[PDB]
């Protein structure tokens, strides 16, 4: 990425991260599964139901996307009717 | 001339051995052909995997193979055996640990 921009002098963010992933404020990134709309006729209905799912990312994938985005995408977002509003806080961890 | 054959290993075999505590839905043993057959509280998937149905302790035993009468291959193998012959297969059971629930006092009405 651009660690220091030539106009301002800040980090830029990779905008290919933004159109693909969703960051929850706990720190988890949420993605759709690859191929979830590709060649659905040759897939069993169990396999098609696995692809229609938002799945979390790895630990290292979450640390790679955290470097790829600035601190604007790591803030509290109090939207009106966010369907992912209940998933931002993390309840009941024992680390 | 001999091309192909670069297939990796399937990583099949027993995932939960004898005496292991196993929750419901844990895959006990993945197989390619029927090496271990299911027993008490153990189901079979489409790919002959053995998953557990109850929460318990895995036991491997040997018991008498009586196939289904609609399974015409094994029945035609049964009816070629001599008169004292008994087949055996290794079965995988789950001995269920917990009971399925207790009666708790709700309220004195």
């Amino acid at each position: 990425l651009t660690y220091f921009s030539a106009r301002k002098g800040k980090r830029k963010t990779v905008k290919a991260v933004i159109d693909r992933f969703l960051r929850l404020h706990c720190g988890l990134w949420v993605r759709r599964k690859a191929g979830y709309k590709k060649k659905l006729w040759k897939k069993t209905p169990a396999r098609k139901k696995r692809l229609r799912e938002f799945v979390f990312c790895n630990k290292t994938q979450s640390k790679l996307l955290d470097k790829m985005t600035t601190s604007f995408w790591k803030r509290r977002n109090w939207y009106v009717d966010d369907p992912y509003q209940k998933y931002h806080d993390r309840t009941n961890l024992k680390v | 001339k001999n091309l192909g054959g670069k297939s990796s290993g399937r990583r099949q075999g027993i995932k939960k051995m004898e005496g292991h505590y196993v929750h419901a839905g844990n895959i006990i043993a993945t197989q390619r052909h029927f090496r271990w057959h299911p027993g008490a509280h153990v189901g079979v998937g489409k790919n002959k995997c053995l998953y557990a149905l109850e929460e318990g302790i895995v036991r491997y035993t040997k018991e008498v193979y009586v196939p289904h009468p609609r399974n015409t291959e094994a029945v035609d193998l049964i009816t070629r055996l001599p008169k004292g012959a008994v087949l055996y297969k290794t079965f995988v059971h789950v001995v269920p640990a917990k009971p399925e629930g207790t009666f708790k006092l709700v309220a004195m009405l």
């Binding site: - | 929750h23 035993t61 018991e63 009586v66 029945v75 008994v86 629930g101 009666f103 708790k104 009405l109």
Partner: protein, 324 residues
């Protein structure tokens, strides 16, 4: 590395070198009978069983079968498969001949002897008939394992049996609300002269069966004791609790068990009447509570789990807002 077998291996004594001269199962049912018999024989390996476990009577019967097979009206009805059998004579012949033994395993299956006499068995040789009167017309009979609602058992039953001193007893084998071992009795009619039950000594008057709501299906057994000498004995539930084993231990020298009749009881609306009006206490209500579902340890980064992973670890499904 090989380890030799401990006992004899199966398919070893029948093992020969000729397989054409040896006669075979040609069928599936001949193999299965040998298969079921072999599973019941004890073996030296691990199995499912280890973890989940006169002369005048024949001469009369051979004369009687030769005459019932001599009537050509019988051999015309049996051959044309329109023959019937009247069950009322078969029921009366069953209770005299082998009905004692079939009632024994029914009390072994239903768990009577391991709760009444701690595994000690006996045979109900005396065919007693307990029956509860319902309304005025009909009467609900109490066989071995029957279902009788407590509305049908509000009043004491009309006990009738063909025999010649006796004590009678009833115990609700699992009706205890406090202790797992003991049992509430319902009526003890002792020193019964012959066949008349109303002449017996009531030392415990008749409580109707009171199984609590949602607490399952109880069992209540009628003990009929063969007795020789009369012996003096002895609404609050601390008086109705005793255990049959150390009661019969006091009187086994003079008295032996001789019959069984046990029935099942669910909750009915009449158990509200027993608990409130005549017992004078609040009734208890039990519910079948299942254990909580197993969820593994919550990971920080639940890799490749669906988005509903976080729902399995929260308890309130209402939005919280923290410090805000």
């Amino acid at each position: 590395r090989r380890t030799p077998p401990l006992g004899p291996m199966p398919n070893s004594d029948i093992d020969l070198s000729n397989l054409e001269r040896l006669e075979k199962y040609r069928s599936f049912d001949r193999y299965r009978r040998r298969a079921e018999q072999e599973a019941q024989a004890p073996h030296w390996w691990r199995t499912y069983r280890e973890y989940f476990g006169r002369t005048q009577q024949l001469l009369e019967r051979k004369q009687a079968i030769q005459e019932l097979r001599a009537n050509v009206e019988e051999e015309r009805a049996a051959r044309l498969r329109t023959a019937s059998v009247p069950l009322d004579a078969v029921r009366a012949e069953w209770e005299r001949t082998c009905g004692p033994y079939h009632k024994q395993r029914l009390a072994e299956y239903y768990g009577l002897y391991r709760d009444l006499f701690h595994g000690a068995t006996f045979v109900p040789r005396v065919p007693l008939h307990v029956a509860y009167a319902v309304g005025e017309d009909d009467l609900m009979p109490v066989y071995c394992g029957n279902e009788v609602t407590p509305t049908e058992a509000a009043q004491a039953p009309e006990v009738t049996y063909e025999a010649e001193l006796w004590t009678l007893l009833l115990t609700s084998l699992d009706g205890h609300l406090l202790e797992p071992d003991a049992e509430y009795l319902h009526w003890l009619l002792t020193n019964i002269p012959g066949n008349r039950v109303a002449e017996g000594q009531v030392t415990c008057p008749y409580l109707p069966p009171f199984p609590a709501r949602g607490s399952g299906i109880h069992r209540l057994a009628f003990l009929l004791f063969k007795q020789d000498q009369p012996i003096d004995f002895s609404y609050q539930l601390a008086q109705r609790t005793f255990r049959t084993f150390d009661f019969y231990k006091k009187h086994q020298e003079t008295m032996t068990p001789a019959g069984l009749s046990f029935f099942q009881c669910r909750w009915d609306d009449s158990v509200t009447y027993i608990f409130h009006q005549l017992l004078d206490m609040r009734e208890p209500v039990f519910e079948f509570v299942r254990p909580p579902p197993y969820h593994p340890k919550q990971k920080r980064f639940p890799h490749r789990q669906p988005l509903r992973y976080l729902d399995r670890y929260r308890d309130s499904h209402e939005p919280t807002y923290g410090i805000y």
